[PDB]
Structure formats: C-alpha cells, structure tokens
Design an enzyme around this catalytic site. Structure first.
Site, PDB file in Angstrom:
ATOM      1  N   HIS A  41      56.322  64.642  48.606  1.00  0.00           N
ATOM      2  CA  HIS A  41      55.271  63.773  49.145  1.00  0.00           C
ATOM      3  C   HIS A  41      53.955  63.770  48.335  1.00  0.00           C
ATOM      4  CE1 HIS A  41      53.925  67.427  51.427  1.00  0.00           C
ATOM      5  NE2 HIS A  41      52.739  66.876  51.239  1.00  0.00           N
ATOM      6  N   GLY A 143      46.224  71.145  51.802  1.00  0.00           N
ATOM      7  CA  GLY A 143      46.077  71.416  50.379  1.00  0.00           C
ATOM      8  C   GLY A 143      46.898  72.617  49.942  1.00  0.00           C
ATOM      9  N   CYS A 145      49.996  72.859  50.671  1.00  0.00           N
ATOM     10  CA  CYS A 145      51.349  72.323  50.467  1.00  0.00           C
ATOM     11  C   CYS A 145      51.871  72.710  49.094  1.00  0.00           C
ATOM     12  CB  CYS A 145      51.366  70.795  50.614  1.00  0.00           C
ATOM     13  SG  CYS A 145      50.704  70.143  52.172  1.00  0.00           S
TER      14      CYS A 145
END
Lengths: 300, 305
Positions: A41, A143, A145
C-alpha cells in the site's frame, strides 16, 4: 535472576531497514541482499485505500516512481513484483549487512521481537505475542508501517511479521514475509474488526512457572485438577482451552520446578476464581500471557 | 498505537560487546576505540570474591593473563589499569564499530535499556529503571557480569550502567562507566542488602499523562491538590515524595495535554485512595512506575536514532 519482557538484540535487523517513498507516502522496507520488501500500500494514495486494485495500480508505476533510501544514499530500484500484500523491489546494490535469515510463518500464541521504525530509522525494540485473534497489541503510530517482527536463533534471523495497519480497536495487523495476512484482514480502508481474543493459557502457566523458579510460590496450592475440569473453568474466564499437547510442552518446566502441570493448573484455576488478593506475581498485578514456555526456559 | 515498554535499538552496543577471561572467570567487556571496559572482579577466582585485595591481585596480573575475544578473533591486550571497580584494558586494535558515545551517571528513577550478554554475545535487550534504593530489578544469569546499560540520543549512545552482581534480594547492582557504584554497594562477596523500595512517583505521573495522550482519560477530575496534601497521601501508599523539581520535569507533558501537574496529582491521589475499580489504564490493572517523562515524549512522538 529476575524476569523481564526481553526482546532479541535488534542489530541484525537494523542494518536491513530502509525507507521507501511513493509520492507523498513513506513507510519502512526490509532490504535483504538486492531485494526490498515493504507493504504494497505504499503505492495507494488517498482515494485508493478505499478499496483499490493493486494489480491495476502497480502496472501503472515505473521503477523511478520508487524512492528508496539507505540513510542518505538512494538505492536504484531496477525492478519489482507484487507478492500477495508485499512489494518485492529489486535494486542495483546489495546489502552487505544482510544477515543469515529465513522467512517463517508464526502460530498465534507465539512471541517475537519488533523493531519499530519511521522513515527507515529505528525508534525502539519490544517483545510481544501474536494474539489468538491474530492481532498484535504493539506501539504503532502512523508511519511505522513496514516494521518487522523477528526471532533469532544463534546467528540466524527468522522474519515472521511486517506491520501493515491499525484496526479500530487500536490493535495492529500484518503479514508474514510472503504477503500472507495474519487473520482474516485485507489492506483496504474497509471497516473491519478483530475477532474476539482469548488469553493464552499456555503462556500464563509458563509465566507462573517462571514465578516459582524465581522464589515466588504464593499462588500454589495442594489440590489438583483434570485437564477436563481446568478447561471447564478457564474457558469461563475467556482463557484458551488447554490441550494435552500444551501440557507436554510444559514438561521441562515441571521437571525443573517439581510442580506437576495439572497441579499448576489447579493453582491457575484458583487464581481465576479468587481474584488475586491484591498480591503480585513477578511484580505483575494481573496475569501475563506474552511469555512462551520456550521464553521462560531461555531467560531462566 | 498501544503503549509498550520499548528498549532502544541495541545494534550500536552489540557492536562493542566482547569476551574477557582471566583463567576460569569469563565475563563480558565493553570495547570502545582501543579500550575494553570490564568489571575488575574478572581477576578473581572462587574465594577471591570473599573480600579481595584488587590492588594487590592486579599487581600480579600481566597483560597476556587477559583473554579478550571478539567473535572468533583474539584482541591483544597491551596494557591494563584499574578505575574504581572497573578494569581498563588497552588493546592493539581500535574498535571499527565504536559509536559516538559518552559516559553519564544516572539518577534514581531514570530508565535505560540493558543488553544482557554471555561469552561476549548478546542474548536479549530490555527496559528497566534505577530504583530509589539504587538497585535494578533486572534479569541476569551468571556470566552476564559486564553487561551494559544505555540510552541513545540522536546518534550518541550514553553508557550509564555496567552490571557487576546480584543481591540476596534477587535485585541487581553495578557501576557507572567510571567504576563508581550505584548506591552503597561494594564489589565483594560480603553481607550487603537493598533498602526498602518506593514507587517512583514522577514516573507514575508520566505514565498517567501517557494514558491521557492515548485518549485514556476516565480517571481525571475537575479538582486539584497541593504538594503537601498529595505527599501526605502518596507516602501512605509508599510513593516517593514529589518535589517541585519533579513538577518542572513534567512541564512538557503538562503543556502537551494542558493538564497542570498538581491537577494530575489530585487524580493520582484518588486512584490511590479508591483503587482502580476493575477498570484499566493503558490496559494495565496497575499503575506503571518505570516510564520516565522523557520516555513518553519519545515513544508518543515517534523519535528515532
């Protein structure tokens, strides 16, 4: 001779963290040899996360669209390929710090170390368990991720988790290092929810054994129980049912404490029924379940 | 995001861990440039731990007595000197992994991360605090002596702890990186014990601001207290007296939430007097006392290194 929530030393993983940006979006990537894994993503933007088509988004992207960075240095992405929910970018540079590693998929109830990151740089490390409902209760601000969970056996790092997203309840969801989600979740801003979570019965008992090994034996009692009767009670308290398998695993610890497993169940059974008397176990004022028998044996 | 107990990334300290041996005694050592730091009792064997004369034993020690190893390789020790309870070994090789660093002595209630090591190889890292009685409730097996404690700032590692020994209590005791002991302990197998511990009140307050920051705020009220009144309660529950100086250290957290320190004390006061009522705070059934005002800013404001 105390009992800390320990993580594996994060060194081998730190030398693998990079930053991966697409337009206005930045998250963390794991750089191994000449490959950079990160949550797919990183390519979505705004009205994409609202159920997007990754095949469709990817095919429209060029190798130059990806800004990868190790510290100052950009790495040139010279190829890519999706694999389930990850991107597997190729690069023209090899990471000399790449440690001996493998990818493993982990069972719920097991534990691992998490090196949390932001913009490719390590913020902290911490130990946790994969809940039985497949979520992890971590510390994850937007952030983070692309941070990874890992285990370390001697010299070899077993990567088992990459963070993708937070759920409504505020717990986190991710995938193994092959893109497979843990739990029935999808990387899209569709409203999903955590399955109900139980307590990890196997871990609690290991934790209780760890208390004993450390001179804390107040919770112990004289009675015993059958596996049957301990489950009838524990499941009332939203504890995960206990299998003979789980019992065997506790074998070595029993041997070491002399306390029989079902007896320790008898103890836990009593702790579940009769509050805790404001007393503490290993300093805890509630029961811990993010310790595996392996862990206890390791630390003790 | 939940709220965990995070250690600093340990990579930089891993890069300085080595193995130091004198005969049978093998512990861990800290390799910075061309110096290796270890606990001076490495020289001892068996009943030397029973009140030994380090000044005299070392006088008989020769450089090659010391077996220092990084990975498989031997590090030639070419000189030694004692510094309080530490040995400073000189080696022929500067550590190419030496990070930016400094030594600091830490104060009671402050936290840091420990990298527990064995045979000079890291086994785990965790987050603990310097207790008010000057001990640390760590996790140490034998061989872990020489294991170090640190905090990181930007790029700079601050070494503040080096493990020497465990107490009858099961708690732990060691020095700053100048060889100075923390608390009233000496590096000898004699009869020393830890004084009673108190709850680090400053940290508990920080922990409460933390909860509020995470939107966990059921425990606030519209009232305030005085230091004196709060202290007369705290002390009944074995909390440390809160000082005006403590109050100032919460300034950043009180400003970021706009909740005055004394206003939060009043809520703490009521948590103490009335228990938690089965409810939780940050999911905890009990108050946390090992997160500092600093730790919170750090972890709730994504600070990296």
């Amino acid at each position: 001779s105390g009992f800390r929530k320990m993580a594996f030393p994060s060194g081998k993983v730190e030398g693998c963290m990079v930053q991966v940006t697409c337009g206005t979006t930045t998250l963390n990537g794991l750089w191994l040899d000449d490959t950079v894994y990160c949550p797919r993503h990183v390519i979505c933007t705004a009205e994409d996360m609202l159920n997007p088509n990754y095949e469709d988004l990817l095919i429209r992207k060029s190798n130059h669209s990806f800004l990868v960075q190790a510290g100052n240095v950009q790495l040139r992405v010279i190829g890519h390929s999706m694999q389930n929910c990850l991107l597997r970018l190729k690069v023209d540079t090899s990471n000399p710090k790449t440690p001996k590693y493998k990818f493993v998929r982990i069972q719920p109830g097991q534990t691992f170390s998490v090196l949390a990151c932001y913009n490719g740089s390590p913020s902290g490390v911490y130990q946790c368990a994969m809940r039985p409902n497949h979520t992890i209760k971590g510390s994850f601000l937007n952030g983070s991720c692309g941070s990874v969970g890992f285990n370390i056996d001697y010299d070899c790092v077993s990567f088992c988790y990459m963070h993708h997203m937070e759920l409504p309840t505020g717990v986190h969801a991710g995938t193994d290092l092959e893109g497979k989600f843990y739990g029935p979740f999808v990387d899209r801003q569709t409203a999903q929810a955590a399955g109900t979570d139980t307590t990890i019965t196997l871990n609690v008992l290991a934790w209780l054994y760890a208390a004993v090994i450390n001179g804390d034996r107040w919770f112990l009692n004289r009675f015993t129980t059958t596996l049957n009767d301990f489950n009838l009670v524990a499941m009332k308290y939203n504890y995960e049912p206990l299998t003979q398998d789980h019992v065997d695993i506790l074998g070595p610890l029993s041997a070491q404490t002399g306390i029989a497993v079902l007896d320790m169940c008898a103890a836990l059974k009593e702790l579940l029924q009769n509050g805790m008397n404001g007393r503490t176990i290993l300093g805890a004022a509630a029961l811990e379940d993010e310790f595996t028998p392996f862990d206890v044996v390791r630390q003790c």
